[PDB]
Symmetry: D2
Subunit: 248 residues, 4 copies
Amino acid sequence: PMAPLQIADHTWQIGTEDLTALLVQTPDGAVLLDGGMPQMASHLLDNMKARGVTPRDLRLILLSHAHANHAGPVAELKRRTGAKVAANAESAVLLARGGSDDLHFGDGITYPPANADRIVMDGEVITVGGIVFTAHFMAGHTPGSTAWTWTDTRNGKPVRIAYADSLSAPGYQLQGNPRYPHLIEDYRRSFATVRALPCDVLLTPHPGASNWDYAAGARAGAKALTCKAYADAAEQKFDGQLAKETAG
Amino acid sequence: PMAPLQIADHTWQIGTEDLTALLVQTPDGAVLLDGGMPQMASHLLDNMKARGVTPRDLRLILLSHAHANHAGPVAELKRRTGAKVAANAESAVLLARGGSDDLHFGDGITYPPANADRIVMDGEVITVGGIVFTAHFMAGHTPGSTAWTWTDTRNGKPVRIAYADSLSAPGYQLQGNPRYPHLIEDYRRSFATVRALPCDVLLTPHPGASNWDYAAGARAGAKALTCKAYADAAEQKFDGQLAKETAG
Amino acid sequence: PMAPLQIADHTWQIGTEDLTALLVQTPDGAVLLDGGMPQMASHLLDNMKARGVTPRDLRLILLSHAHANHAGPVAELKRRTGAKVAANAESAVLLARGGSDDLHFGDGITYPPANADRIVMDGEVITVGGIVFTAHFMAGHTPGSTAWTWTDTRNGKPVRIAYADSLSAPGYQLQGNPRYPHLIEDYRRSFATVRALPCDVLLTPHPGASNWDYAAGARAGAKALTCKAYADAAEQKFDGQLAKETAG
Amino acid sequence: PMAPLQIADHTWQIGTEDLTALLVQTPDGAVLLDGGMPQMASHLLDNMKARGVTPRDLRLILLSHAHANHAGPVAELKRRTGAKVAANAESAVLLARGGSDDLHFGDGITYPPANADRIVMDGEVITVGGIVFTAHFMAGHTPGSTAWTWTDTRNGKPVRIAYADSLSAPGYQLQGNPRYPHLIEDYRRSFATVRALPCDVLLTPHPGASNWDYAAGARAGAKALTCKAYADAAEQKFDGQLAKETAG
Ligand SMILES: [Zn+2]
Ligand SMILES: [Zn+2]
Ligand SMILES: [Zn+2]
Ligand SMILES: [Zn+2]
Ligand SMILES: [Zn+2]
Ligand SMILES: [Zn+2]
Ligand SMILES: [Zn+2]
Ligand SMILES: [Zn+2]
């Protein structure tokens, strides 16, 4: 449960030390990318207030994916701020039933449900205060898993920021999943997708994945990974769950 | 986990010893009034299968009120049976946001969200194979709190059976409650209603309030109270909570 | 189809000459009350800009009732603006299903559905920029039918503004209606509700019911009935309808 | 207003000349595919009676895509029968908003909204009475466009039927469409998908697009294209629509 952490000029890390919750400050208003656990709600705004943003200053909420530890407070944040939610149809029906009936977890990770305001399509752009957010679909971890890119600045120099959802598969049945018949082929597109993302700075729903150390302060992003690296790691791990899995 | 327990020719208590779950067997389908806690879906069906009812058999699902311990498994149930859900507007909206944003409890007693299939109005009857269920709104415990009544036959003779919702108010602010300006006003009107219900037998979400010993055989409904008595003991505690409210 | 019509110092009519839609401007943002027909999203939006209110400025949307000729463009207004919708449970479920499955009209008037962001109980107050709006439930025309009250100033001289919903029953089955078993007792108390509203200035969804003439510019609401007169006039019309239905 | 039209042993066209509604009767309940125009609910139910399928015998509703002239009466059906709907994320959201905020038609084509009871992934199979229905996503005409393939038993002999959704882009802006950046990419993949469908018999939302003739009765589907032909024909038109588009 950290305090505001500058990543680039208009991008800050506002979610705890082991849970990315990105704040992108635009004149036209603020933007929240993920929000952590259902309980991290007021904390989120706290960092908002000190950051200069107030509830009515919250314009938009984007998600990496609609699970409880990453979209937990979306509903509470909407009630308490000026937030509207933009998500793909997949993230949207899932956000909407509170993470319930999860392809792989069922009801083991339900949060309170929220309604989406906008339905975005793969490669759709969202401009907030002259700041353009591009959506990159990467089905795998969830059918609606998404990647968000945007160019910020550091030294005045343009910095392309890729917010990549997990490429992980926490104990999933990959081959012949009747609930997700083409899981493997989706995940494989997703690896190559992240792999080619306009990436100067990468961040991930879990900071460990990108090698980020939010506790390291000015060093929190010194050994941080590349988009390519994290991709290939994630694949080595999947082909490693897919190998062992084959027989038995 | 208990075994079914006849109450009338076709009414059975398939819940637990501490959570009512009234199963009603009609020729052209079977009704379920409340289903207790969310984790009680297997048992609910378990109890149904062991009573001459498959998933294909659950035709209807009515509820006393949209709280976790009384409507928790309805989402799961629909997904596993051909069950439809009939409920009033107020319960329907609450069912749909998973028990979140509770007037009195907030997100403290959340559960998987479900969509109502039918919206019913005060005094509306639902007939499933010749059995008439008449809806009695009794706002208070929740805005949508209802009393479901129907005639059965015990030993082959008519038994008018009232499934009155909780008239309780665990930890509520009664007056000056901005989220429920007319609370006291509604609670009073409900007692008068709960008291004038066509009452031969009285069943309630929590067996205690009606005075029912579920795990005590056919002598379970021996110390069970009347409608009148239940609302009487209901107003008494309220008027004393309203009185204990001038303090704080 | 007209240009903005001022009612009070910060309260304008912006719909059409046959359809009411009120813009209430406050130091914290605009508040809209009904919107007319689905096709009117752009007109209303013109007027608001004419009035110095930009889309970002619309923050709240209130409704008399969720019929197509009054709640029509609400869904698009939500997409085109950051406004949020507040409504009671009945009006929230009827709005969410675009008007379909009407208790009396069925599916003959559907419009783009929408989600209420906030559900409100009877007598609940909402404050926008120091101004307070109070919801008065007046069930009948629709079971969600709401009267909205606030006070402005017509001469730097406080006027009580009452926006009350229709009290009509256009071809409604009154007594014996299975979709509305208690229609008669709701209307009745609804009359007695409208009658006693704080009401210097009265407005109705249909100008033609509270004797307004949006063309009359300077006067217009000068031969306009009072709340007592409206209320009384409806039950008169109402008590005429029942009479017929009964013996006739 | 056409009487049922036998397509195979247990597959009928119960719609109209111009629009395709398929009834697949199975040991365990009947399945329906598309319903046509919003007002077509009673006609279907009538045709369903003329085939021994009572409202309670309707179990599952499937969809090509959630446009008005194909999914129009799905909500009245769900209300008048014990039928449930299975659909993908894309379709389920468009259906949940009545065909409003269309990516290409906006809100000019609106119908009663309906909730999905089940969400399917690409290539997910749904069995009803031993009969297996497989979903093939063919994103294009709508993002949620789907093709359903089942195998009947014509005259004791199985048959491989293919209900492929429209593959048209009527008036669509194909290149650089803000709401649909990967449109063209999506279609190409969808042309491929239709081409290779298990396809003895091919049927389409609009009969003519697969050159059926519902007035031709027994003839009806005699000079009717093959999946292979249909697809490539659709790709052909798409190529001309594209190139012609690039030249302003
Ligand atoms: Zn996750
Ligand atoms: Zn995670
Ligand atoms: Zn409760
Ligand atoms: Zn309880
Ligand atoms: Zn109306
Ligand atoms: Zn009207
Ligand atoms: Zn279409
Ligand atoms: Zn069509």
